[PDB]
Amino acid sequence: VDTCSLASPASVCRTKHLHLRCSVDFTRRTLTGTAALTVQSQEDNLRSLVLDTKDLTIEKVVINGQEVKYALGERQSYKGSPMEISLPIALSKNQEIVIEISFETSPKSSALQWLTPEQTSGKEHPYLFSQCQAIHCRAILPCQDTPSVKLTYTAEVSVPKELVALMSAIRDGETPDPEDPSRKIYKFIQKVPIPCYLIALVVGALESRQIGPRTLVWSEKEQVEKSAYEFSETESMLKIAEDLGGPYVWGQYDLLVLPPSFPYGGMENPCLTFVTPTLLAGDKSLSNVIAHEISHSWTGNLVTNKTWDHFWLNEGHTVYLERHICGRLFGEKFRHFNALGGWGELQNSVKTFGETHPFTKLVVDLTDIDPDVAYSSVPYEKGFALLFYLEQLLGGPEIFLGFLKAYVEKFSYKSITTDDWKDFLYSYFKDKVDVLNQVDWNAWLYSPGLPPIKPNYDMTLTNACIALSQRWITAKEDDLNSFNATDLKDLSSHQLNEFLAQTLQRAPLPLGHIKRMQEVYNFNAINNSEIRFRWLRLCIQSKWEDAIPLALKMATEQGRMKFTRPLFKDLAAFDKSHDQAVRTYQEHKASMHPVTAMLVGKDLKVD
Ligand SMILES: O=Cc1ccc(Oc2nc3ncccc3s2)cc1
Ligand SMILES: [Yb+3]
Ligand SMILES: [Yb+3]
Ligand SMILES: [Zn+2]
């Protein structure tokens, strides 16, 4: 049972295909069109079915060429409104019909962000992008908005002729719109069954450059060159990922660099990964996000969580594959460094919610919980830590990678639960069941807080970060003179980030220590978004007023939640910047991503 969806479950009827025909109206901020769903009955004598909708205007429902009766239920908060449709003829089990729905989206759709010319790089054209994960596909079209249903799709998108439409699918052509010469129709085909949260659309003044034999990087003209260099390791990562997970079934692996308000680091949309421009560090240092997005082509896209309570299956396995890719490219000592950093990030997540909080559980109960509110580092890191613990318990990376490949093969094109994963783990490791019976499963899967066991980590690359961090924490006024730019000479960008994360865990530090850290290390000059973020957090939490304009700027110039949310919270918790944070939020709210605006408002407790 999927508690986040109001649609008929997979045991009643299953959507097999979507044929989407729509037009993007920028003056009205609406998507208008038809969604023809091929639905297969799973029951005898089926006479009605329910679909998920969220702020959609329904014009009509057509079956067999005639209008049918439908009814829209009362809105159920973040879940939206149920749409019950009365079928004209009762269906037998396995019978397939085509239901065509005429719909229109709301300009306030929580799936979309409509950007004015001023909000883009070019300044001449508007832009539109979607983000359906977890449950925002219902805010675009009527569907069974659950990952337990996998469908194929085709689409025809009418857009102003000067603009380009792209989807999480293979490009199948473009023609002038016959009903309007100022418009262009873009055609798309997704022939691999996908859960509907993987449906994605972007409309804008987009340009592309080839960077690999199966990869184009897409972005506005101004970011093309930087993005092509930033993501040049894409193909080498795909090759490694194919070696670990088996064949790449999606044909194309394109990348799209979104405008700065993109709410996440990346989004694993089939054929076209969406990424934040905050990755454009200039040295490929933030490429682990591409490795994560690539890994999802197996773990998440092929093997999917049946419900949002099992989201850790998608994330945990993706982080595990991500760290193997980076370990193949940069060495095992580097995989351990990233694994160790991940544990640190889990420690922070558990502290923020509290060690008893239900969102610190690996397997959650999302009954009456908005998935956007539950979202955190927990499924990623507690999920990673479990797998890394099993890897060490079961005989190392080579043995565990064998399980992972077999896991993807066993569950490809299917939606699964934790019990399914656990059952196959025991089946796969039958000769090591006694070892598996030592795992405290109830604590690992169902308990809040830090895991009952911490894996073993190589410390080589972490040691210098720890030593530097401890020098700064234990320093007194008379020790500040000993610090010099030479302290950093042998530290990588990654190690510098880890020095800051280590220091930030013991924040606040005395104001004089932070003024000195700027004087000798000039952290204000670093443009790398991960470093800059942690450095500004450390300045604000340590009460440095000079950092207020800098943190406010970073929180509003980009909108990646990982950065925007803790910056606003830090600025709101600092007395000197509290009122500024509140006013800035209020002034930017209307031009923010709807989900970001929602969550920041909750974190700030603003009306
Ligand atoms: O990337 C965007 C996104 C992805 C998933 C999502 O929903 C969930 N987040 C969780 N965190 C913990 C446990 C379960 C869940 S379900 C919301 C937004
Ligand atoms: Yb074709
Ligand atoms: Yb001293
Ligand atoms: Zn992910």
From Swiss-Prot:
Pathway participation: Lipid metabolism; leukotriene B4 biosynthesis
Residues bearing the modification Phosphoserine: S412
Annotated cofactor note: Binds 1 zinc ion per subunit.
One cellular component (GO) term of this entry: tertiary granule lumen
Effect the entry attributes to changing D370N: No loss of activity
Gene Ontology biological process terms, A to Z: leukotriene biosynthetic process; lipid metabolic process; peptide catabolic process; protein metabolic process; proteolysis; response to peptide hormone; response to zinc ion; type I pneumocyte differentiation
Regulation of its activity: Inhibited by bestatin. The epoxide hydrolase activity is restrained by suicide inactivation that involves binding of LTA4 to Tyr-375. 4-(4-benzylphenyl)thiazol-2-amine (ARM1) selectively inhibits the epoxide hydrolase activity.
Binding-site positions, Zn(2+): H292, H296, E315
Effect of mutating D372E: Strongly reduced aminopeptidase activity. Abolishes epoxide hydrolase activity
SUPFAM superfamilies: ARM repeat, Leukotriene A4 hydrolase N-terminal domain, Metalloproteases ('zincins'), catalytic domain
Annotated consequence of substituting K562 to A/M: Strongly reduced affinity for peptide substrates. Reduced epoxide hydrolase and aminopeptidase activity
Subunit structure: Monomer.
Name of the featured protein: Leukotriene A-4 hydrolase
Native species: Homo sapiens (Human)
Gene from which this protein is expressed: LTA4H
